[PDB]
Amino acid sequence: DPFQVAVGVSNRHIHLSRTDMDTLFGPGAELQRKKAMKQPGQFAAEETVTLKGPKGSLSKVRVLGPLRRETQVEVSVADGFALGITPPLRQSGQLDDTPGLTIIGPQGSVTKDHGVIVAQRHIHMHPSTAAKLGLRNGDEVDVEAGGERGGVMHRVLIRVAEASADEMHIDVEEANALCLKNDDVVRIC
Amino acid sequence: PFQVAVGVSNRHIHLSRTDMDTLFGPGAELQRKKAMKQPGQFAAEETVTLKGPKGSLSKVRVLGPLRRETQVEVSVADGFALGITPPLRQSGQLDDTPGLTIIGPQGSVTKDHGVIVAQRHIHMHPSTAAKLGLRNGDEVDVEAGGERGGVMHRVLIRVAEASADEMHIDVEEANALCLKNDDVVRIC
Ligand SMILES: CC(C)(COP(=O)(O)OP(=O)(O)OC[C@H]1O[C@@H](n2cnc3c(N)ncnc32)[C@H](O)[C@@H]1OP(=O)(O)O)[C@@H](O)C(=O)NCCC(=O)NCCS
Ligand SMILES: CC(C)(COP(=O)(O)OP(=O)(O)OC[C@H]1O[C@@H](n2cnc3c(N)ncnc32)[C@H](O)[C@@H]1OP(=O)(O)O)[C@@H](O)C(=O)NCCC(=O)NCCS
Ligand SMILES: [Zn+2]
Ligand SMILES: [Zn+2]
Ligand SMILES: [Zn+2]
Ligand SMILES: [Zn+2]
């Protein structure tokens, strides 16, 4: 079924700028690959950080490479409460009016004034696949999950880009609410 | 009409008298902290620590009153934190379930069973069930609006006299829908 798409489940994690990488891991430090993600060029790094909010901290928070233009922190709704912040629900890069927190690495720390979000679900899709399915960048679709916690997710954003692999991204709470894990399959309706 | 209020459940425990005595002392009684929506049910002041093969969860709320048999309700995520795989179950369906060590102020007990991931359900008063043409054991689709809107399939209807109209979901199910206590969802 060509409308079936693989699931990628995201635990809390961070993307770093070079300025913050330098602060956290030392000047000129380079991320080490641990595991490639499904999206071209993206990977889980060996490196981890601590996130510290007004209420508490989350440790062993995975860094995702490569480095980006701007630091971005993705956490679950649950994580927000543990941290003591209220991150808005956003697509990647949509960081206007977002809270920050303190990031701690082995060689230093920095207190960000912004950049923390709850990740809004979405489907990455290659232009060829989009053509075959009749979808365009920015379309919203329903997505159905089978099984014991089966259901439908409404108005899921389609992100079409040449450097993309066909994959739906949801966070760990969204996945557990559907009894899904990495490489499970869902269906675009 | 077909609208029902949401009740969101964090991890918690229901205790037997035998286990209550061990954990909190012989003849100890639960102290009421807050009434739940369901008649007779309440969050207690008492809390325990849950300990599994991999790790522990602390400040786990006890729900009263005491029951015939200890039952532990945790999230899928909680299962991974503890190091067990609880099946998805309705309350009281505890055959072939894993256990845990329950740690209290006056003692501890290692249970050989009783931990579940709570399966979502709607508590419904018989009058309400009548109005909606629903009977006990029926399954229904439930829709949530908002920015994580969607539909939950095959939600079990639990009719009983001592019930209030309320959907019960766990904290991950709620956060996956950006719902909290007293938000309204709709039976399809
Ligand atoms: C079951 C219940 C009593 C659990 O007790 P509890 O854990 O003490 O409940 P609380 O609401 O006080 O939870 C407080 C914690 O949840 C956190 N929290 C708040 N919103 C949260 C969210 N959306 N996601 C994750 N955590 C959240 C708080 O930060 C707090 O953390 P802290 O203790 O470290 O300060 C409670 O969930 C409840 O009353 N549910 C109503 C639904 C119901 O009736 N269930 C019946 C089960 S049979
Ligand atoms: C984002 C990512 C790299 C985060 O790295 P990570 O946190 O190190 O990932 P892991 O899968 O190894 O998480 C392992 C932890 O999750 C726990 N875990 C496993 N399944 C779980 C579940 N269903 N619910 C909660 N926790 C779970 C494990 O017990 C373990 O905890 P521990 O470290 O205390 O032992 C990872 O989630 C991922 O690879 N996602 C793929 C999807 C993707 O590409 N997202 C990109 C977003 S831009
Ligand atoms: Zn990310
Ligand atoms: Zn993504
Ligand atoms: Zn319960
Ligand atoms: Zn219930």
Residue numbers in the entry:
A (entry chain B): 36 to 224
B (entry chain A): 37 to 224
What does the paper say about this structure?
We collected a native dataset from rPduLΔEP crystals diffracting to a resolution of 1.54 Å. A CoA cofactor as well as two metal ions are clearly resolved in the density (for omit maps of CoA see S2 Fig). CoA and the metal ions bind between the two domains, presumably in the active site. The first zinc ion (Zn1) is in a tetrahedral coordination state with His48, His50, Glu109, and the CoA sulfur. The second (Zn2) is in octahedral coordination by three conserved histidine residues (His157, His159 and His204) as well as three water molecules. The interface between the two chains buries 882 Å2 per monomer and is mainly formed by α-helices 2 and 4 and parts of β-sheets 12 and 14, as well as a π–π stacking of the adenine moiety of CoA with Phe116 of the adjacent chain. Our PduL crystals contained CoA that was captured from the Escherichia coli cytosol, indicating that the “ground state” of PduL is in the CoA-bound form; this could provide an elegantly simple means of guaranteeing a 1:1 ratio of CoA:PduL within the metabolosome lumen. The free CoA-bound form is presumably poised for attack upon an acyl-phosphate, indicating that the enzyme initially binds CoA as opposed to acyl-phosphate. This hypothesis is strengthened by the fact that the CoA-bound crystals were obtained without added CoA, indicating that the protein bound CoA from the E. coli expression strain and retained it throughout purification and crystallization. SEC-MALS analysis of rPdulΔEP is consistent with a dimer (as observed in the crystal structure) with a weighted average (Mw) and number average (Mn) of the molar mass of 58.4 kDa +/− 11.2% and 58.8 kDa +/− 10.9%, respectively. rPduL full length runs as Mw = 140.3 kDa +/− 1.2% and Mn = 140.5 kDa +/− 1.2%.
More recently, a second type of PTAC without any sequence homology to Pta was identified. This protein, PduL (Pfam domain PF06130), was shown to catalyze the conversion of propionyl-CoA to propionyl-phosphate and is associated with a BMC involved in propanediol utilization, the PDU BMC. Not only does PduL facilitate substrate level phosphorylation, but it also is critical for cofactor recycling within, and product efflux from, the organelle. Structurally, PduL consists of two domains (blue/red), each a beta-barrel that is capped on both ends by short α-helices. β-Barrel 1 consists of the N-terminal β strand and β strands from the C-terminal half of the polypeptide chain (β1, β10-β14; residues 37–46 and 155–224). β-Barrel 2 consists mainly of the central segment of primary structure (β2, β5–β9; residues 47–60 and 82–154) (red), but is interrupted by a short two-strand beta sheet (β3-β4, residues 61–81). The active site of PduL is formed at the interface of the two structural domains.
